[PDB]
Amino acid sequence: LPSQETCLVEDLLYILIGVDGRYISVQPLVGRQSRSFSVEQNLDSSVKELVNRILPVATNYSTVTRFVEENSSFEYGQVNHALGAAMRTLG
Amino acid sequence: PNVLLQNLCCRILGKGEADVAQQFQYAVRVIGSNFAPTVERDEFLVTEKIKKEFVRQRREADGALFSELHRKLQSQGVLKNRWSILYLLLSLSEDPRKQPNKTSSFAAL
Amino acid sequence: MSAVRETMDVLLEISRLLNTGLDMETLSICVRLCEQGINPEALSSVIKELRRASDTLKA
Amino acid sequence: EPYVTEAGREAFDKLYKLHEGGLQILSATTLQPQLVLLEETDLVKAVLNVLIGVVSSTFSYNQALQSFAVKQGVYISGTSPDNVSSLLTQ
């Protein structure tokens, strides 16, 4: 049980970055417009509800990283090419 | 009924869980002889015997209390088995005066 | 089970006033016996015989 | 020897199990309620969780009331005699 918590905090740390975890696997929806994270099932439902409430903040993260890596994929002098490169500074 | 009658045989003696065999078989025989009673049911009549008995032993206050307790008893839950319960307590009723001789010297006979 | 706890506190008042001399555990056995059906005469008759028997066995 | 008062917890526990049993016979249900081990230090961690609104192995969350539900039986309840069964609910 505490060892399975030390599994979680590190796996959690990796999916903030948009890197595919060890026991939190990532299913790409359209190449990660929104990331459907599959966290390991329970053995203890206590740590289960704590990691469930952390993976949606990384779902909100997948939407901005899909878009700001798409303004490089559509290189133009436009107001979006500066907009998302400034969000890369925030990320 | 067997687990219940038995547990009574162990508790009453306060000791023995097969050393109470004699008393069990005996209880079973006794219960196996068919008694018929003098009056079966009516809450009022059994309650009255207990009131008269109260007066008779000079525990008049308590007799007064018993009536409060009787009414209370119905409200904590209604009994279908009351006459029999109230009887059992009746037959075990005692007087606050005098002892029953010795029954700790009576064993030696 | 909530019910079962309340009845016994009022019942214990009558029995101790009236002189009966049954502890808690035993008073529960009789209530079981009376609910499963027993002749009242038999129940009083045994209790009186077991008591008389017990005191002599001990002494 | 000791009486119950001096004798720690165990003596009181043996007593509680015996006393509850006495009542338990008249009530008939599928299976009688029995104890399921937790320790006193394991109870204080299941309660540490229920303050944030997370389930343990004594709490079952009910969506129908949007409230949590503890074990109602003679489920271990510390060494208290079915006192934490009401105290932990508050």
From TrEMBL, chain A:
Signal sequence, start to end: none
User: Which residues are listed as membrane-spanning?
Assistant: none
Where does this polypeptide localize?
Answer: Cytoplasm, Cytoskeleton, Microtubule organizing center, Centrosome
Family assignment? Belongs to the TUBGCP family.
**What is the role of this chain?**
Component of the gamma-tubulin ring complex (gTuRC) which mediates microtubule nucleation. The gTuRC regulates the minus-end nucleation of alpha-beta tubulin heterodimers that grow into microtubule protafilaments, a critical step in centrosome duplication and spindle formation. Plays a role in neuronal migration.
Could you give the subunit structure recorded for this chain? Component of the gamma-tubulin ring complex (gTuRC) consisting of TUBGCP2, TUBGCP3, TUBGCP4, TUBGCP5 and TUBGCP6 and gamma-tubulin TUBG1 or TUBG2. TUBGCP2, TUBGCP3, TUBGCP4, TUBGCP5 and TUBGCP6 assemble in a 5:5:2:1:1 stoichiometry; each is associated with a gamma-tubulin, thereby arranging 14 gamma-tubulins in a helical manner. Gamma-tubulin at the first position is blocked by TUBGCP3 at the last position, allowing 13 protafilaments to grow into a microtubule.
Record protein name field: Gamma-tubulin complex component
Query: Could you tell me which species this protein originates from?
Result: Xenopus laevis
Q: Gene name?
A: tubgcp2.L
Q: Which part of the full protein does this chain span, and how long is the full protein?
A: 209 to 299 of 896
From TrEMBL, chain D:
Localization, per the record, is: Cytoplasm, Cytoskeleton, Microtubule organizing center, Centrosome
> What parts of the sequence cross the membrane?
none
Q: How does it assemble?
A: Component of the gamma-tubulin ring complex (gTuRC) consisting of TUBGCP2, TUBGCP3, TUBGCP4, TUBGCP5 and TUBGCP6 and gamma-tubulin TUBG1 or TUBG2. TUBGCP2, TUBGCP3, TUBGCP4, TUBGCP5 and TUBGCP6 assemble in a 5:5:2:1:1 stoichiometry; each is associated with a gamma-tubulin, thereby arranging 14 gamma-tubulins in a helical manner. Gamma-tubulin at the first position is blocked by TUBGCP3 at the last position, allowing 13 protafilaments to grow into a microtubule.
- Report the family membership: Belongs to the TUBGCP family.
Say what the protein does: Component of the gamma-tubulin ring complex (gTuRC) which mediates microtubule nucleation. The gTuRC regulates the minus-end nucleation of alpha-beta tubulin heterodimers that grow into microtubule protafilaments, a critical step in centrosome duplication and spindle formation.
What name does this protein carry? Gamma-tubulin complex component 6
